[PDB]
Amino acid sequence: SSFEKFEIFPKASSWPNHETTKGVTAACSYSGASSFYRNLLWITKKGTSYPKLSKSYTNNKGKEVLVLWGVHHPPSVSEQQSLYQNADAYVSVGSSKYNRRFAPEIAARPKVRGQAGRMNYYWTLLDQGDTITFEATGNLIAPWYAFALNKGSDSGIITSDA
Amino acid sequence: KSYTNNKGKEVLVLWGVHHPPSVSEQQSLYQNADAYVSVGSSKYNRRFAPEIAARPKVRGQAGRMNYYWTLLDQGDTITFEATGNLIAPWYAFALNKGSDSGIITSDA
Amino acid sequence: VNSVIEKMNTQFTAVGKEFNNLERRIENLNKKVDDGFLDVWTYNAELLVLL
């Protein structure tokens, strides 16, 4: 029925070693200028040096938490070299019931919206109690907000124009 | 290592793939930073690779282990071929038929 | 009475099934199927007796 939007990782505090801003493209354009999503965060390096990152989070809200993230991959080798200084890379998400390593791939492909790279998106429900750990080496889109869900069933989607 | 059957009925075979959460534990248990296992038959064929990642402890354990099963046919063989993480089967089962059974959750 | 008995067929084994957290769609379909057949059978039985 309802949720509460809150912030897991603050943009200023949770990322001391990397670059928070400069995470912006023209394919996601707002008011003529370039922008990005309001719940995620592109992350690049602070000065051509990428520390391997690891960060955890617990919940206490008594309800389930719905967490999103994304995995970018560029289509060319030199773009992966430019953005992250590591030809090999992986990210990894761990919890009690969810556990997956991701690796990027590099391949040539036709442009859509003037972009040749791609980005996959992932979601996981958390339980009360149990934690989650992100642990990344080249391509993490970190969550910047998340949601705490209530109950109250029997709703849905209607496609109409009334 | 290979295995054939002769029992005239289907054989239900299990195994598992371990992975530890840290690099040094994988170094300690198997002396190989890279590893793979592989299971081959006629209709089943899969390579597995381990992964190493940090994750919170459950039951005082931070490693994980996946589990797999495959029905065999009469005749056809199966081969295990491993380099770092095989949980080998130690028993297996030969199944009969006779249908219309199931599971009941009750306390009578 | 013997005709009304012998028209209704007996049902064989039916056991509820299992699903993980990523197959909610098929489970909702399963529940819709079972409740729909249950409503049709109880409607036919009550209407048959009342006529």
Side-chain angles (χ1 to χ4, degrees):
Chain A
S1 67
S2 64
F3 61 90
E4 292 179 354
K5 180 176 75 173
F6 65 97
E7 191 175 10
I8 292 176
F9 299 121
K11 185 175 72 176
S13 66
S14 295
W15 297 98
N17 295 319
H18 295 282
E19 185 70 28
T20 61
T21 182
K22 301 294 187 292
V24 56
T25 59
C28 297
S29 65
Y30 181 73
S31 70
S34 296
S35 180
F36 186 70
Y37 296 100
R38 301 293 179 89
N39 293 317
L40 296 177
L41 181 62
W42 182 273
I43 290 170
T44 324
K45 306 171 270 76
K46 184 177 86 274
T48 68
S49 65
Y50 189 88
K52 180 253 182 63
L53 64 94
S54 65
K55 184 66 69 69
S56 67
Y57 179 69
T58 74
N59 58 357
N60 54 0
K61 301 292 180 69
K63 299 180 290 294
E64 292 180 353
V65 179
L66 186 271
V67 178
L68 288 82
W69 61 91
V71 174
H72 176 80
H73 62 272
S76 65
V77 178
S78 179
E79 184 68 27
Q80 181 63 257
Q81 183 61 254
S82 176
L83 292 176
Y84 296 106
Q85 291 296 322
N86 292 317
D88 193 3
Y90 66 96
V91 308
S92 64
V93 179
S95 68
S96 291
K97 65 180 73 174
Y98 184 76
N99 188 5
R100 189 176 291 173
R101 183 183 178 91
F102 293 108
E105 61 91 17
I106 292 95
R109 61 181 66 91
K111 291 182 181 180
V112 174
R113 294 176 62 88
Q115 296 294 322
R118 294 292 183 270
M119 187 183 290
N120 292 318
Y121 296 95
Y122 295 97
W123 61 272
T124 299
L125 288 170
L126 292 175
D127 290 331
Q128 60 180 356
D130 184 69
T131 74
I132 191 168
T133 59
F134 292 99
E135 186 179 4
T137 59
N139 281 312
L140 182 62
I141 304 298
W144 183 48
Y145 289 111
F147 303 99
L149 301 178
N150 289 315
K151 298 296 186 291
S153 298
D154 293 331
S155 295
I157 311 300
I158 292 172
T159 60
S160 67
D161 290 330
Chain B
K1 184 66 69 69
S2 67
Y3 179 69
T4 74
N5 58 357
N6 54 0
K7 301 292 180 69
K9 299 180 290 294
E10 292 180 353
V11 179
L12 186 271
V13 179
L14 288 82
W15 61 91
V17 174
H18 176 80
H19 62 272
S22 65
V23 178
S24 179
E25 184 68 27
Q26 181 63 257
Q27 183 61 254
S28 176
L29 292 176
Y30 296 106
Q31 291 296 322
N32 292 317
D34 193 3
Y36 66 96
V37 308
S38 64
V39 179
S41 68
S42 291
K43 65 180 73 174
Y44 184 76
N45 188 5
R46 189 176 291 173
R47 183 183 178 91
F48 293 108
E51 61 91 17
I52 292 95
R55 61 181 66 91
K57 291 182 181 180
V58 174
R59 294 176 62 88
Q61 296 294 322
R64 294 292 183 270
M65 187 183 290
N66 292 318
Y67 296 95
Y68 295 97
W69 61 272
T70 299
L71 288 170
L72 292 175
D73 290 331
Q74 60 180 356
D76 184 69
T77 74
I78 191 168
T79 59
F80 292 99
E81 186 179 4
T83 59
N85 281 312
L86 182 62
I87 304 298
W90 183 48
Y91 289 111
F93 303 99
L95 301 178
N96 289 315
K97 298 296 186 291
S99 298
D100 293 331
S101 295
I103 311 300
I104 292 172
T105 60
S106 67
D107 290 330
Chain C
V1 176
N2 289 320
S3 177
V4 172
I5 290 170
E6 70 182 2
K7 291 298 179 181
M8 294 301 294
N9 289 318
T10 62
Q11 65 179 358
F12 293 99
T13 64
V15 178
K17 296 178 182 179
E18 294 293 326
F19 294 99
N20 55 3
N21 54 1
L22 294 175
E23 293 176 355
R24 184 66 59 85
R25 186 174 62 244
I26 304 168
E27 184 178 1
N28 290 319
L29 188 146
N30 192 4
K31 188 180 263 77
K32 183 176 73 174
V33 166
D34 288 332
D35 291 332
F37 282 113
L38 191 147
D39 290 331
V40 171
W41 285 112
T42 186
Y43 178 76
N44 288 318
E46 290 184 354
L47 192 274
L48 192 274
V49 176
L50 285 175
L51 291 178

